[PDB]
């Protein structure tokens, strides 16, 4: 059926359309119906279900209690294509699916469809509550970060109640508890300001299986204590003060898994949901034309550029400056002006809203809606704002190259016949990628899928001395990846030394996790020897500790999993986004910068 | 070198359904070779539980009996 | 001497026959809100009203038709029928009748009169007639109802079908249609931060304020009843024929009767093998009861649930 | 008593691939025939009951081998 | 071949399909699970004939299983 | 796939399936026609000196790259000169502002790049162009509602498509309306344009409700009133998504952007009963079932009066003929039309003789093969054929 | 009437949207200037100059119509016709610029910046921030769900495979493809992998014992062999290669 | 059917410790969840009679901050722990207690002087911890009764009039209500789906039964609306 948004509803659940159901359980019903005794014989259960009156509709809900779905969506990239859920009869013909899963599945609202499939016997159902059910996983088994992640309008909202504003009534109050719910819907004051000081207790896990509370007085605004309802005890005051964007909210159920275990993360989680939306919608966010405001400036930098490129046509004109230069001048004009445009937007939309306590300027961050919504993490980026409000840049020519004049027009004022029917060249070149990228890398999954299926992680342990040099990734522009988040995981060949000779912090082989990648982070190691699979640690399995960490649940990969595939869709499902072929990638021009001299970042 | 390397497994009836299944067959055909069933797609066309996860248990068990006799 | 105060009903005013505002003069700090969002909810919920249900026309057997010079479809015509507004007096059931010929429109006027029936808006169209020789007569039905209730679902009555020709169309009963409220500052001065609500209404001339507003606050002043105290903290297996009627003859009745066997049930969940051991049973009455239970029941066997008795 | 997390069954025995095992041979005992719960009923299912039962540390391998045992030895 | 609608079939089903599916979910013994696969298929596409009675007692072979045991399942 | 340059205003670039043929099948621009030759060629304004003449020339691809031609957006004066000195045009392959006397063309209205379909999308500027690609291809999909709303924002396209999709009744010689009626339409034609000894006036037969290929209603409901004057070219009725001449293929709707207790979230809609009770958006649906009665190898087939093995109950809709009656409500599988197929000679033996004696035979071999309703479908029987052959002796209801 | 996600409209960049609300708000308004001044009972002149004067607002625009020409009645008839809203048209690329749809808004006493202070419908408390509200003009697409929704339990099979049928009509279940099994292996769950291969799809005896024990309340498997395999081993019999089952 | 409507038959209340409660009535009308428990919710935290500290004086410093002879804790702290103080009045409306401590250990409320009118809930509630030496603290904390919630704003500022020095205001917490959360959930009766049932979690300070203090506010709402029924079913 289709699918509809779940925004009640928790985690393991599902809304399932009731005339839907019904069908699929009619064996089930029949049973029931046969041991109330309802029917003596097959034909008058059938013809009661068939005529679906009274009983059976109370008798369905007897079958489905418990009795865990499992639902799947088209293309199943990875595993997390199909999970597993307790269903929730709902009259209708289409069918809830709760927020924080259509992360993995994919899945938008604009006519998506679902399959829905039912285990039956126990063994199944079985499989179906403690592997498939959405509340086991939710970190995703690739990179180990979690999915579930809040997306799009609970970031809104989160990030709409904790802000500083300057003055907005109420502020510099004292209260504790905080509880502060009081103030907010009372009026009374405005969640947004007032950096209020509020007194908080903290429960920090310092001491070993006990909680120790700490209490103070803490500067903070209102939303903050708001939202500090919710976190589960065990974190940090500090968790939740600050602007709180997405970013800031994965690590926040990052900490909460790793601290303090599944069990209170995904209701945490869940929580976190609600009063995101709570909240976001409380906020009245909305977008309007004066939303997108354009700097007073950009006519300026135009016809300077405007100007320039003259003046370099003319030299051409007076035959200096041959179009082969002049073509990779032109565009080393627009693109400054197109940075220079863009720089003076971002100015001008972030920070302003200039509010006054007696000093009359303390020049706060813009509370703009367009700012907002790029700002939070919620939708869009930086670039897709320069379209609306700067210029919309060099267009890129269907055959690889640039045309020497962009576009000047944001979509705020349109774009010319001209323009548009220029930037049509590059839509569709690009439409029709998605195409290919489908194809090709579906078959990239089949093939790896099938080399590495028959692999299944059978010995516990090897005892195999080889490994792989463990380091970071360093190049020209500084590094790209730190060697904590290679090392994360994995385990120990050999030992490690620090910096001082004959020193070990880590014995043997040693599972290495967060505690153990903050001794190695605190110390100067610079290289760590790592166990690996493909040093073959036993025969056919590729023992657990190479290997080594499963990613999902955090502790070391159990006996008996695939990994095969789990390799192959996780290489596999990503490259849907790709780049794919026929790029050069310069942005600048095509001659080298030929400086052979090398320059360093730090000391 | 992955597809070179999927067609080259031990199980004649894995890499026959992968790729190529004029050739995969007339090796086998020739050769006489016996499948053994121990990878995962042999399982799943045949219809048997996988050596893997919940069945794995399971062909351990059997596994046994093949060692003990 | 804290206490409270009381609001009143005064000052009515009445812009037109659908438009009114009513005031409510004397209330504290934070109870205009309270009341204003209140009396709102009530009001567009429910509200009690007067809709047409079916239309059975002389013309014609289904929507879809059409009549002959009329120039209207019948669905149109269906529609126009559900925007007509009119108030009763006792009767909940008030079939009425219309009949016309001639050249022009059919307005609400034309309805036969009857003495509790009163049409709010006689100008009301309902489709027309192209030429002479065509006339209209209908017949429609309106009764009293407070949600909306649509066509499709009101028809689980089933019972005897309703006749060929019979139109049903959707319900809108509550006449109630836009309200707004706010609050402003009393001018009593006898004590500041006293301010009064104000209620602005539109309904189509079925409901008089007073009446919408008294309706509204009786059902959710009865709405509150458990909180002013808190308080606290058949299916079964169709036959019981004993089993003396069945005729067992005289052997096998008896070997049931030595288990203490009453009715069906008890004994009809059992397994041959666990019955067939037993005294004076034998091959020959196994078969016999099998013969006389292969009739009616033909269970011999469940796991049942539990007894009434 | 639904169970949104079984990790508190998982610690019970680790690997959840075994508890599936577990919780289903205990399951399926309840569900056709010959046993009866250790647990309070709370109108739920046999499944979640079983993972019950294992949560408390009541029934896992060794208790259903020397279960087992114990049944064989009687009968 | 596949991936195209070929003439594979329905799998309709008749009396004498539907039937044994209705004895397939009725408590019948191992025997009398015989004797009702043996009536089924003496049922007709017309009903009523089940055709000769003595012929469905005698088609088992004797050894027991009286005229009564097929008389009560028929 | 590629938009190349000579698409200008020829085909479009905006719409086109966003399917797997991409590209590959595309839609005529406005303006655009197609020679003797059979090449798309389209219209330009001539430029002499650097005035504006009036008269058009249709240039083909091969013509255009030889000239200059200017903007369709772009400035002008009373006399036809140009404002601006620098004018931006396009050359061969190219684009690039040239002199006032240089460009001889110009490219008439700015809809040329444009299609049809995307020729009425409001404010198509603002809009991205992939964006723009898919509603152009949404307004296609849509599907006409009981009461038609003209959109209230629009581009002014819509009296043409209506009227030339030829869909709308339109008048023909037209004058002053002597009847009119929802079926039915007739002008008395004015006494100026006439065939003479013909005399007369004009009918017009509209058309009720009548299934399309995508199993939608089509219907025509009388704009005009009585006793009104009509020219030709005005329309006298609507089609279904027509309001007095325009195009309308949705409703206008009171829109509040904001998010709202997580109900809108990704691309999802939540909507006030309201909408729902006034019964915009409810659209009809009429789908065809047939039943043929025809002669087999064990002689013909009759319809109805009568069935064996079936209940009074089941036959109450039907007619003395058998087919059921006009105006019937539906469902399930209630027997649209009865039908009988006859089976091989029964004979004799006592029980034959005796069902034949007890029940009449009930038409013996005959068989239930009739015009039940397909499972989960339901509605009112609107309207019912039976064509016949000829030295049947059909009589009954035919 | 209708509500709507704002956080659509900036990453997707299409404000074809959004300036199709404010014009819509703005082409409402004027219809409810007239609206409420035909229900007044006004003065046929007065309504005329309204009408005149609304016409005739913006920058050029070419369109010249004036009253004046048509008399008496003729501008009650449109200004009947146009009750409901004014029915504003911008042509495709020449349209009209924002500052014609602020001026247009500032004759229907809206607020030129198309956004309004609005209520919680529940709480009937103000949201924080106004909105914009805005008459968009809405369809309704050909996908419906009445002809998507299907689930089936037990159906009619395929003759040869022995297999569910294909789609809805005919009743089909629901292809269980190779990336499905590579999820469910994945997982490492095989039960639920066997009942999909075998039981509900190919094994013939073995849905008959499934829903036999499923509607007796069993549920266990008594899994067997699939058809489709079966038939494989004949159809690789058929060269002249044998393959059997050795135990 | 007719003007007839539910009532909620479930109306149970679960409980945590004495002072947070949680009830829930099911069914209601669909609507109803919202409406009944926004006008509850809005009234506990609006209006609702009781009594808190409307000021404190203390001797020595009048200034906002001070070192306040060594108490260990600034007397913002002391102030806002003298805010959620408990306190039961009679009759009279306003009433000014003295409290003076020496010696070494916290200072509890059980210290406070003991007036007949005047109750105290808890003395586990700590105003200061004082400081070890020979030293000693002696203030004057003042009640009086109100209603809802009035902090500081305003409180009578008395524009700096004020002769015996002091004050130093403290904001008041009238109604003895702590949070108060409503929620709508999903119920069912016979076939009709769409129904309503509503959740009241609440907890208060003390002082009153968290459901006793529901009921309170349903009879001023209904006290309210008393001049509108009397029309239809007065008895």
């Known amino acids: 059926s289709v699918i509809t ?94 927020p924080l899963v259509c992360a993995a599945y994919n899945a938008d609202f604009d006519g998506d469809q679902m399959a829905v499939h039912v285990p039956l016997t126990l063994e199944a159902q079985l499989e179906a509550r403690a592997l498939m059910m959405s509340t086991n ?177 003319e030299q051409f004109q007076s035959g200096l400056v041959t179009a082969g230069e002049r073509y990779n001048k032109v565009i080393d004009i627009w693109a400054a002006a197109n940075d220079r445009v863009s720089k003076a937007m971002m100015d001008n939309l972030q920070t302003e809203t200039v509010i006054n306590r007696d000093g009359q300027e303390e020049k706060q961050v813009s509370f703009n809606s367009i700012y907002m919504m790029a700002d939070s993490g919620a939708r869009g980026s930086a670039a897709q704002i320069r379209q609306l409000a700067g210029m919309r840049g060099l267009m890129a020519k269907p055959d690889g190259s640039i045309i020497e004049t962009p576009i000047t027009a944001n979509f705020r004022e349109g774009l010319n016949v001209l323009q548009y029917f220029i930037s049509t060249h590059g839509a569709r070149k690009g439409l029709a990628d998605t195409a290919l990228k489908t194809a090709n890398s579906g078959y990239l999954t089949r093939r790896l899928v099938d080399v590495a299926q028959d692999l299944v992680v059978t010995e516990d342990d090897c005892g195999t001395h080889e490994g792989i040099m463990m380091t970071p990734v360093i190049e020209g522009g500084d590094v790209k990846e730190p060697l904590r988040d290679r090392v994360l995981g994995r385990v120990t060949a050999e030992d490690v030394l620090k910096p001082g000779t004959a020193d070990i912090l880590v014995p043997r082989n040693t599972l290495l996790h967060e505690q153990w990648c903050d001794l190695l982070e605190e110390n100067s190691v610079d290289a760590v020897k790592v166990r690996s699979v493909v040093s073959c640690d036993t025969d056919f399995g590729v023992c657990a500790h190479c290997y080594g960490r499963d990613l999902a649940r955090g502790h070391i990969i159990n006996k008996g999993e695939a990994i095969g595939v789990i390799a192959a869709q996780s290489i596999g499902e990503p490259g849907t986004q790709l780049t794919m072929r026929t790029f050069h990638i310069g942005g600048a021009a095509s001659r080298a910068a030929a400086e052979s001299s090398i320059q360093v970042k730090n000391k | 070198g992955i597809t070179k390397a999927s067609l080259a497994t031990e199980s004649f009836i894995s890499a026959a359904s992968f790729q190529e299944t004029t050739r995969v067959l007339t090796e086998a055909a020739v050769a006489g070779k016996r499948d053994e069933l121990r990878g995962l797609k042999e399982n799943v066309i045949v219809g048997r539980l996988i050596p893997a996860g919940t069945g794995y248990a399971y062909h351990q068990d059997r596994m046994r009996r093949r060692a003990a006799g | 001497v804290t206490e409270f105060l009381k609001p009143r009903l005064v000052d009515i005013e009445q812009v037109s026959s659908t438009h009114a505002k009513v005031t409510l003069e004397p209330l504290e700090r934070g109870f205009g809100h309270t009341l204003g969002n209140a009396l709102r909810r009530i ?102 109802g407070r949600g909306y209730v649509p066509a499709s679902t009101r028809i689980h009555s089933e019972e005897d079908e309703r006749p060929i020709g019979r139109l049903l169309v959707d319900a809108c009963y509550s006449p109630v249609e836009r309200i707004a409220y706010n609050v402003e500052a009393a001018r009593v001065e006898q004590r500041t931060d006293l301010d009064k609500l104000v209620i602005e209404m539109e309904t189509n001339g079925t409901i008089d304020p007073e009446e919408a507003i008294r309706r509204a606050a009786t059902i959710l002043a009865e709405q509150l009843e458990a909180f002013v105290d808190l308080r606290d903290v058949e299916f079964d297996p169709i036959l019981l024929r004993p089993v003396d009627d069945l005729e067992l003859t005289v052997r096998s009745a008896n070997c049931l009767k030595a288990e203490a066997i009453h009715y069906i049930g008890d004994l009809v969940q059992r397994t041959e093998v666990e019955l067939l051991k037993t005294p004076n049973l034998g091959k020959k009455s196994l078969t016999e009861i099998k013969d006389v239970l292969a009739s009616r029941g033909l269970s011999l066997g469940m796991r049942l649930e539990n007894w009434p008795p | 008593m639904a169970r949104v997390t079984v990790q508190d069954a998982v610690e019970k025995i680790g690997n959840r691939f075994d508890l599936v095992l577990v919780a289903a041979r205990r399951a399926r005992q309840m569900q056709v025939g010959g046993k009866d719960p250790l647990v309070p009923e709370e109108n739920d299912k046999t499944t979640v009951i079983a993972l019950r039962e294992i949560e408390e540390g009541l029934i896992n391998n060794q208790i259903l081998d020397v279960r087992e045992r114990q049944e064989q030895q009687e009968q | 071949d596949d991936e195209l609608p070929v003439y594979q079939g329905e799998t309709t089903q008749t009396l004498q399909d539907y039937l044994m599916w209705q004895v397939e979910l009725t408590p019948f013994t191992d025997t009398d699970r015989a004797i009702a696969t043996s009536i089924v298929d003496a049922v007709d596409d017309t009903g009523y004939l089940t055709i000769q009675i003595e012929d469905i007692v005698d088609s088992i072979g004797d050894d027991e299983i009286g005229l009564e045991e097929v008389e009560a399942v028929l | ?348 033996t006592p029980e034959e003789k005796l069902l034949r004696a007890i029940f009449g035979e009930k038409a013996s071999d005959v068989k239930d093969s009739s015009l039940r309703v397909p499972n989960g479908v339901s509605g009112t029987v609107i309207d019912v054929q039976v064509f016949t052959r000829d030295g049947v002796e059909k009589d009954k209801r035919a | 009437d209708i509500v709507l996600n704002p956080l659509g409209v900036p990453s997707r960049m299409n404000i074809g949207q959004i300036l199709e609300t404010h014009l819509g708000m703005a082409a409402k308004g004027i219809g409810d200037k007239i609206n409420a001044m035909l229900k007044q009972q006004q003065e046929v002149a007065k309504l005329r100059e309204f009408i005149q004067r609304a016409y005739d607002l913006g920058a050029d625009v070419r369109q010249k119509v004036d009253l004046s020409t048509f008399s008496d009645e003729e501008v009650m008839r449109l200004a009947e016709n146009l009750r409901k809203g004014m029915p504003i048209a911008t042509p495709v690329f020449d349209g009209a610029k924002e500052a014609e749809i602020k001026e247009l808004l500032k004759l229907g006493d809206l607020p ?24 968009m003009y809405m369809l309704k697409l050909n996908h419906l769900v009445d002809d998507k929704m299907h689930a089936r339990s037990t159906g009619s099979y395929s003759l040869v495979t022995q297999q569910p049928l294909g789609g809805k009509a005919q009743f089909g279940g629901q292809r269980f493809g190779e990336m499905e099994v590579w999820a469910l292996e994945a997982y490492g769950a095989a039960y639920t992998l066997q009942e999909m291969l075998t039981v509900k799809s190919d094994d013939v005896n073995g849905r008959t014992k499934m829903y036999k024990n499923i509607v007796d309340g069993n549920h266990q498997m008594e899994p067997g062999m699939p058809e489709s395999f079966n038939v494989l081993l004949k159809e690789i019999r058929s060269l002249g290669i044998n393959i059997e089952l050795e135990d």
Not at chain 6, 303 to 312: C, Q, R
Not at chain 7, 117 to 132: A, S
Request: charged share 25%; glycine share 8%.
């Open chain 1, 5 to 98: 948004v779940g925004p009640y509803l928790r985690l393991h659940q599902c809304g399932l359309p009731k005339k839907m159901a019904l069908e699929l359980f009619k064996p089930f019903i029949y049973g029931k119906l046969e041991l109330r005794g309802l029917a003596t014989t097959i034909k008058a259960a059938k013809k009661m279900v068939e005529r679906e009156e009274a009983v059976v509709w109370d008798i369905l809900d007897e079958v489905i209690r418990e009795h865990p779905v499992l639902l799947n969506r088209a293309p199943t990239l990875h595993r997390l294509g199909i999970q597993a859920f307790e269903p929730v009869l709902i009259e209708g013909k289409a069918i809830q699916l709760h």
């Open chain 1, 137 to 313: 996983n939710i970190l995703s088994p690739a990179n180990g970060e979690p999915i579930i992640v809040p997306s799009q309008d609970v970031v809104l909202g989160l990030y709409y109640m904790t802000r500083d504003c300057v003055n907005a009534k109420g502020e510099g109050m004292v209260l504790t508890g905080p509880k502060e719910a009081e103030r907010l819907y009372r009026s009374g004051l405005a969640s947004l300001h007032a950096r209020v000081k509020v007194r908080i207790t903290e429960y920090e896990k310092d001491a070993n299986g006990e909680l120790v509370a700490k209490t103070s007085l803490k500067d903070t605004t209102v939303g903050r204590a708001i939202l500090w309802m919710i976190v589960p005890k065990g974190l940090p005051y500090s968790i939740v003060n600050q602007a709180l964007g997405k970013k800031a909210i994965s690590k926040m159920l990052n900490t909460c898994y790793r601290i303090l275990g599944l069990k209170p993360t995904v209701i945490f989680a869940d929580q976190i949901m609600y009063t995101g939306f709570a909240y976001a919608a409380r906020s009245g966010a909305s977008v309007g034309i004066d939303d997108m405001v354009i700097p007073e400036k950009k006519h300026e930098i135009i016809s300077e550029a405007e100007a320039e490129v003259a003046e370099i046509q």
């Open chain 3, 43 to 144: 009001l567009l919920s429910s509200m009690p009203g007067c809709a047409v249900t079916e239309v059975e026309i002389d013309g014609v057997l289904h929507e879809y038709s059409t009549k002959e010079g009329v120039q209207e479809d019948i669905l149109e015509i269906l529609l126009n029928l559900k925007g007509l507004a009119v108030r009763v007096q006792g009767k909940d059931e008030v079939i009425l009748t219309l009949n016309k010929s001639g050249i022009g429109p059919v307005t609400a006027a034309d309805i036969t009169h009857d003495g509790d029936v009163e049409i709010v808006k006689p100008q009301h169209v309902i489709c027309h007639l192209t030429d002479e020789n065509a006339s209209i007569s209908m017949r429609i039905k309106v009764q009293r």
């Open chain 6, 1 to 348: 796939r590629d938009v190349h340059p000579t698409h200008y205003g020829r085909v479009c670039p905006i719409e086109t399936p966003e399917g797997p043929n991409i590209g590959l099948i595309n839609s005529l621009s406005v303006y655009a026609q197609t020679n003797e030759y059979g090449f798309l060629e389209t219209p330009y304004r001539k430029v002499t000196d650097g005035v504006v003449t009036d008269e058009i020339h249709y240039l083909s691809a091969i013509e255009e790259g030889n000239y200059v031609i200017a903007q369709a957006n772009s400035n002008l004066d009373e006399e036809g000169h140009f404002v601006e000195d620098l004018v931006t045009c396009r050359s061969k392959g190219e684009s690039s502002l040239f002199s006032r006397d240089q460009v001889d063309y110009m490219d008439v209205s700015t809809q040329q790049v444009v299609s049809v379909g995307a020729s009425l999308i409001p404010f198509l500027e603002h809009d991205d162009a992939n964006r723009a690609l898919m509603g152009a291809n949404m307004q296609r999909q849509a599907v006409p509602t009981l009461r038609a709303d003209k959109p209230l924002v629009g581009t002014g396209m819509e009296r043409a498509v209506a009227v030339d999709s030829g869909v709308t009744a339109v008048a023909k010689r037209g004058g002053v309306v002597q009847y009119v009626d929802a079926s039915r339409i007739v002008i008395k034609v004015n006494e100026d344009e006439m065939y003479p000894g013909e005399a007369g006036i004009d009918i017009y037969n509209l058309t009720k409700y009548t299934r399309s290929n995508q199993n939608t209603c089509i219907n025509q409901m009388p704009c005009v009133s009585l006793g009104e004057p009509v020219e030709r070219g005005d329309v006298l009725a609507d089609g279904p998504s027509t309001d007095l001449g325009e195009l309308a293929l949705g409703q206008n709707m009171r829109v509040a952007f904001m998010p709202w207790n997580g109900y809108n979230f990704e691309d999802s809609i939540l909507v006030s009963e309201r909408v729902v009770q006034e019964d915009r958006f409810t659209t009809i649906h009429i789908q065809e079932l047939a039943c043929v009665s025809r002669d087999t190898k064990l002689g013909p087939e009759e319809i109805t009066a009568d069935i064996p093995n079936v209940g009074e109950a089941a036959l109450s809709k039907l007619d003395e003929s058998g087919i059921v009656y006009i105006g019937a409500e539906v469902t399930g599988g209630d027997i649209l039309v009865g039908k009988v197929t006859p089976k091989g000679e029964t004979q004799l």
């Open chain 7, 112 to 135: 030129t910046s198309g956004q309004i202070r609005l209520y919680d419908g529940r709480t009937g408390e103000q949201f924080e921030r106004p909105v914009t509200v805005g008459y």
